[PDB]
Design a protein around this ligand. Structure first.
Ligand SMILES: C[C@@H](C(=O)OCCNC(=O)CCNC(=O)[C@H](O)C(C)(C)COP(=O)(O)OP(=O)(O)OC[C@H]1O[C@@H](n2cnc3c(N)ncnc32)[C@H](O)[C@@H]1OP(=O)(O)O)S(=O)(=O)O
Ligand SMILES: C[C@@H](C(=O)OCCNC(=O)CCNC(=O)[C@H](O)C(C)(C)COP(=O)(O)OP(=O)(O)OC[C@H]1O[C@@H](n2cnc3c(N)ncnc32)[C@H](O)[C@@H]1OP(=O)(O)O)S(=O)(=O)O
Ligand SMILES: C[C@@H](C(=O)OCCNC(=O)CCNC(=O)[C@H](O)C(C)(C)COP(=O)(O)OP(=O)(O)OC[C@H]1O[C@@H](n2cnc3c(N)ncnc32)[C@H](O)[C@@H]1OP(=O)(O)O)S(=O)(=O)O
Ligand SMILES: C[C@@H](C(=O)OCCNC(=O)CCNC(=O)[C@H](O)C(C)(C)COP(=O)(O)OP(=O)(O)OC[C@H]1O[C@@H](n2cnc3c(N)ncnc32)[C@H](O)[C@@H]1OP(=O)(O)O)S(=O)(=O)O
Ligand SMILES: C[C@@H](C(=O)OCCNC(=O)CCNC(=O)[C@H](O)C(C)(C)COP(=O)(O)OP(=O)(O)OC[C@H]1O[C@@H](n2cnc3c(N)ncnc32)[C@H](O)[C@@H]1OP(=O)(O)O)S(=O)(=O)O
Ligand SMILES: C[C@@H](C(=O)OCCNC(=O)CCNC(=O)[C@H](O)C(C)(C)COP(=O)(O)OP(=O)(O)OC[C@H]1O[C@@H](n2cnc3c(N)ncnc32)[C@H](O)[C@@H]1OP(=O)(O)O)S(=O)(=O)O
Ligand SMILES: C[C@@H](C(=O)OCCNC(=O)CCNC(=O)[C@H](O)C(C)(C)COP(=O)(O)OP(=O)(O)OC[C@H]1O[C@@H](n2cnc3c(N)ncnc32)[C@H](O)[C@@H]1OP(=O)(O)O)S(=O)(=O)O
Ligand SMILES: C[C@@H](C(=O)OCCNC(=O)CCNC(=O)[C@H](O)C(C)(C)COP(=O)(O)OP(=O)(O)OC[C@H]1O[C@@H](n2cnc3c(N)ncnc32)[C@H](O)[C@@H]1OP(=O)(O)O)S(=O)(=O)O
Lengths: 260, 260, 260, 260, 260, 260
């Protein structure tokens, strides 16, 4: 029923498997629109737990935001109705637990997407990179906030400022992952936990997830502080460095950033 | 001088030992009223540090909220004056450190109670479960907030959505516990730390504890968000699933949750 | 040049080395004024990353606030324009990453200072203590907040209430440090990471750092709560214990705290 | 068409006239559901401005909440999905100006309803009463906040604590009303203002209205403060005085309030 | 029963009359202690409304804070435990309405005290001044907040920056006062209103008063902004101008302020 | 001196007279840069109060934002470093009182500018309008908040949704203006007040002004709410209606708005 995902439901658990490997499951508008439609279709009383996964043996879980669809004009790359911003809101408001079951490497916006989900179970060979400083992208407040609820600030700043991949073992040690398992155990481990969750009280799960959502969002600031930050972000997405980040990716070369 | 607790004072350290083993130290009104009286009586200048403990050899530290005192149908089970809500506020506002020294298994409200205390030192054989989703309970905002200050969101969501016990070793790894020790060393280790804290400046301890309390609570939201969450909670504590959770527990059978 | 720091630039990396070993790099006004001048001088487009370090072989990284410079009594010791409060604001608002490269022991205000920096890389032999309860000091809200973004509340309360040192290995485990390395490798490891960060997009790093700073501060409270805390702090800095803490340190004896 | 309202369109202006005079336009569930449907149906680009009115000559604009439909005992009378709570949210979120055009007396929930609208224009003979203290009702935070954006706190407390009606002339002087007009000029005056607003930029009006709505709601508090207020409200809606207020109103006698 | 106040009970209304004419009802610690004891004594179910008043015929309602009890310099003059701060908190938290009935001139902290009360009814000859800029006093955030809930910002700034007295008629027009009456009618007009309030539901009044209090306080800021303000206040109470303002009053001369 | 302003100092009062009459004191960058420099140059201890005025006899006080300089492409017209946004921040942070002394008509951004100042004294013939809905402009959160601290919400909505001029008498009645005087008395009245203020304690005035500024700004919201509002504002400044409003103004014709 979907071009870019495959859904299998057994009992009360649904697995949403990405079907966009020819583009390394990059978060293009057409891929995200399918993922959201699939989730909306599973918002039914008889579904109690969702798993998100890439196909078995994927080297790349998701290559993150489709760099071709990043606006290189004068507009904000991560506005409120950007597909990545829509799917993280939808995951976080969804009244059922969503488990990210990760095999392969996770990049940029896709790292934010799994951090927005409720649990992350990962193969021992998976790797995680947060990439905006590679491309000159001024990541937005909501998007950065979504990266701060698991690991501490010093770890988050290392991940962002270096853009270096971290292993699953390190991602477990710093609090980003729930569980790391050998890849041959990943599906069996994840289905055991999803089917267990699906026997618990769904209305209690939904209200507790929504309470955590609101508490997690409840770092408040005044209008002047947000407008000041928006001005700073606009100076970045208007920058020569932002154009250079995109151009360098599309030309398959290393960017030369100059601080303008 | 209390029916349900025993208090020992060693210089500047007070040990409050539960005496409600016939009910597995369940957080009944009569038990919590004695605990709160004991704490109030120890709010004196020559006391500097409190330890909360179950008796030596306890299999169960606390079975959590007394399910017989949970209101069935229509009343908020976790309103502001509920005993569990009163004791977590009292622990958090108490101007001396309160150390939970844990032997045995810890369940639901009792897990929130040790999470509200300042330090947790646990036996290597202790276990920890958060149980609302077993019973259909819409846990309240303040109570959920009290579970978010140590382990990250993904870990808290695993504990709540699974209601599965975690070991002391895992609870240490994820940041819930301060120390794990062999049960034979638990009392000596905890008293050594309490005596050490009691040599320090108590007015500085009290103000720093209060600063951490107000900073930990400073996740603010507007009245409409709180009323929306209260409406969601009422729908859960009015639900068939909430009645089925209570009944299933009291009848020792597996609940059948249907999502209304 | 500077009397109390030495600055070296290697390509786009600047290393600020303390030069106040005769006072164990205590945070005196004259030392902090030099550190702040050196940091302000390095806010240039050809500088991409800052390392703060003590001299190679230092037993003591920093002994913390200069206890001679604490007000005698009846005056807030951690007011907004105190040197420690100035340097942490400056580190946090600085538009380049600041890495604390730690060899030796870290005490009190100096622990808050490295916690305010972006990344901490430490020698396997370094140690960390938070000391206000040794001296009777009512640490301020901003200062305490700066200690809560890495490790959990129970961990922070143990560090503050015991004032006991922790090892680099424990500091790694609880989320305070990024990396622990053998002292012989510390400089090479830190420089390699700083050089790596120096090729990334500086405007993206600066706006993301500022987004994290704003989100990290966005725990808000009403005026009454702040004034209530300030009144509690004033009762501490007016106390006999505060005078006894100061006196004991200078006279080189154990304080006798009495709770007034 | 609608059973309980009549809608007329004059170019870009829609007038919604109450048709529930046999029950003095009391805010029963069936009347509010019709009013909300009529508003929803007018959320189309060719409508620019809404007027809410009672029929010409009405002695009673609205008698407020239907006292028969108030939750009888132990149930929150102003929960999130109560009709009065739903209509005020809808009015405030509606992307066109809504003008309350008032002829006759306004009572209780109907006063909060016109206060939630964007402008109020009233007949010189109209009167206004806020009545919960007559019935023993614990008015909810959102509802009280809606009464606080026009007149000062001393004026709102006088209105609520006395439940005394005020004249249109006094309501204008204290800032509740935009305009007071002779009854035979009311309809003409209101329509010329609605037509004038309808010539202005609708997307600008919508975003400015929504900005005012969020700034008006942005009085934020922590969870414990909300739960404490909810507990106090529950003690009121559980009180004998709350029963006495309802019963006295329905039996047409003076209530005897005793303070429990 | 009190040295410095006289209490009369009329049915369910209590009238607390100042008896400190010798010092023009300046808010000395001992006067405020009796006023607070009198309030505490009246916190009984048989009392439904309080009036605060000066004696009949008073030229001065209250000369405001006792200038002789302000500190000489280098100390916060309006700390949390100051008598003016205590009495405004107690009036705002008191579960019965408190009406200020004003005959005579109102100065400084006494103007804040009546503003903290629920309703103000004043004689046509009464006058109102806010005086901190006459004395060089840095008024505190809570205190300034208490002046902003009735008149608009421009009016409040005029009152504070000019320290010029305003008439009762002007105070009515700008929203400070509920009612202005001829002095011969003041006592019976105020009592008629207090008797009317005393017939209403007291639990409903108490919860609505508490809801208004927390909504009024719910302007939230981060710790850094509060500490920044406190630093600015400290510069003022450390200033030569603060000492000049205190000296000029003592010496009965016009202060010469210089901005240091 | 300054091309676009004239400054006269009388004792401790500085009168800043607009000198941009050929564009009716529209807020061009060149005019605002001169006003800000003149204000900065007056930040000296010997200056105690500022008056902002148009030239004596002016029909137009200020024609508002320069519509030729409004980003007429598709970028934010009211971004953080726009001249109107800069001058309102500078007026509000300025440590001396700033009185707007108004003769003539005040439009749009110029209305926000006088609302941001401390006191407004106006000629009886002056008039005031807020005009964004004439041009299709999505006024920003900070700008809208600057209009909400004097009159109530209903009055602000009437001013904005109608864009109709109000008289000085109406502006006084609704709490926008401090005083209205005959045009012949305007200088005498305003200078008498400015000289009176100039006798008072400047450090007390500066800290109380900053306390009001912070309290006035302290309506806080979460990142998601800000980003949602920014998305809505962008849809408006990208609209055909925004282009129509600008074109219509340039072509001296009535705009025809269509809701796209
Ligand atoms: C903006 C946010 C964001 O999420 O940005 C994207 C962040 N993602 C990345 O930076 C990952 C970039 N890609 C890679 O690092 C490598 O391509 C990986 C490791 C994903 C795969 O390497 P592999 O050797 O297996 O195969 P190639 O590199 O040769 O790429 C395969 C094809 O997919 C394109 N591709 C990869 N990622 C992509 C892609 N995110 N978009 C479009 N296109 C792609 C890539 O350009 C190539 O295109 P062609 O077929 O035209 O040669 S933020 O977080 O950074 O702020
Ligand atoms: C609602 C909140 C809360 O805190 O709820 C309570 C959560 N606590 C639990 O769910 C613990 C449930 N109990 C157990 O798991 C086991 O009873 C325990 C493991 C603690 C120990 O098991 P053990 O084999 O030693 O002996 P039994 O299960 O056989 O029970 C012994 C008696 O104690 C009662 N009991 C146990 N816990 C209880 C009890 N929290 N109350 C009343 N009653 C009990 C139980 O109903 C039984 O009663 P009878 O002797 O009358 O048959 S929330 O966090 O979940 O939202
Ligand atoms: C107020 C905040 C704060 O940061 O407070 C300061 C916190 N710092 C400390 O508590 C560290 C206290 N010092 C020590 O633990 C030891 O002195 C150190 C361990 C770092 C190393 O000991 P070591 O054996 O190597 O050599 P000494 O102890 O013999 O001291 C050498 C000289 O340095 C002085 N000293 C050390 N720290 C200091 C010093 N922060 N100031 C002034 N003076 C000192 C100390 O008093 C001695 O002075 P003399 O010249 O009189 O011998 S808070 O965070 O606690 O609230
Ligand atoms: O022992 P415990 O570790 O529980 O608590 P103590 O304060 O007793 O720590 C032992 C010693 O380590 C010091 N210490 C505190 N912070 C520190 C620190 N960052 N580095 C090294 N060492 C420290 C502290 O001053 C103490 O010194 P004494 O041996 O003179 O009592
Ligand atoms: C709970 C909130 C709220 O909104 O509550 C409702 C507040 N409303 C009032 O307090 C209005 C009370 N009513 C009046 O003051 C008078 O009825 C007015 C002036 C509205 C109408 O005067 P009039 O002489 O024309 O005719 P009656 O009093 O003779 O009543 C006509 C019929 O309408 C019923 N009625 C009036 N208001 C009502 C009614 N809000 N509900 C049901 N029923 C009614 C009342 O019970 C009577 O019914 P019967 O025909 O059975 O005798 S809160 O804000 O107070 O918290
Ligand atoms: C600091 C805060 C505050 O509330 O400060 C106090 C604000 N109040 C004032 O500034 C009012 C100051 N007083 C006056 O303006 C006049 O004294 C009054 C007008 C109120 C009445 O004048 P009158 O001519 O009738 O008779 P006197 O001036 O002769 O004063 C009678 C005695 O009362 C003392 N007095 C007046 N107000 C006072 C007094 N607030 N304290 C102590 N003492 C006094 C004053 O010093 C004098 O003392 P001796 O008998 O020793 O001469 S803040 O809000 O300003 O920031
Ligand atoms: C975006 C914000 C804002 O402030 O927008 C602007 C709001 N302002 C207005 O709507 C006022 C527009 N101006 C007028 O309506 C009229 O000019 C008034 C009534 C003020 C005065 O009319 P009058 O016939 O006496 O003499 P002119 O129209 O001839 O103007 C004199 C010179 O200044 C220019 N001017 C006037 N207002 C202006 C001007 N806001 N810009 C540029 N330029 C101007 C105008 O175009 C003319 O220049 P030229 O001599 O080159 O033709 S918001 O608040 O609306 O959102
Ligand atoms: O009747 P009402 O006042 O409601 O008609 P409008 O709202 O249409 O505006 C009346 C006229 O006053 C102008 N106006 C707007 N602000 C203003 C302003 N502060 N001062 C003076 N006049 C203004 C506005 O430009 C309009 O001008 P036209 O006559 O050219 O249509």
């Amino acid at each position: 029923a979907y071009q870019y995902v495959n859904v299998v439901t057994i009992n009360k658990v649904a697995v949403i498997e990405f079907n966009y490997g020819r583009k390394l499951n990059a978060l293009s508008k057409v891929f995200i629109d399918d993922l959201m439609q699939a989730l909306s279709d599973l918002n039914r009383p008889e579904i109690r737990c969702i798993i998100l996964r890439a196909p078995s043996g994927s080297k790349v879980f998701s290559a993150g935001h489709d760099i071709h669809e990043l606006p290189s004009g004068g507009r904000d790359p991560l506005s409120y109705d950007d597909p990545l911003r829509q799917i993280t809101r939808m995951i976080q408001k969804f009244p059922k637990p969503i488990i990210s079951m990760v095999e392969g490497s996770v990049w940029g916006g896709a790292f934010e997407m799994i951090m927005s989900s409720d649990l992350i179970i990962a193969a021992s060979t998976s790797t995680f990179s947060m990439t905006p400083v590679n491309l000159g992208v001024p990541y937005n407040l909501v998007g950065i906030h979504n990266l701060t609820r698991d690991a501490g600030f010093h770890i988050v700043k290392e991940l962002i400022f270096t853009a270096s991949p971290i292993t699953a073992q390190r991602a477990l040690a710093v609090g980003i992952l729930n569980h790391v398992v050998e890849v041959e155990e990943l599906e069996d481990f994840t289905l055991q936990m999803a089917h267990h969750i699906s026997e618990k009280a769904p209305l209690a799960i939904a209200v507790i997830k929504e309470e955590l959502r609101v508490l997690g969002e409840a770092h408040t600031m005044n209008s002047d502080e947000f407008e000041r930050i928006q001005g700073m972000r606009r100076a970045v997405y208007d920058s020569e460095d932002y154009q250079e980040g995109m151009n360098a990716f599309l030309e398959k070369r290393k960017p030369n950033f100059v601080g303008h």
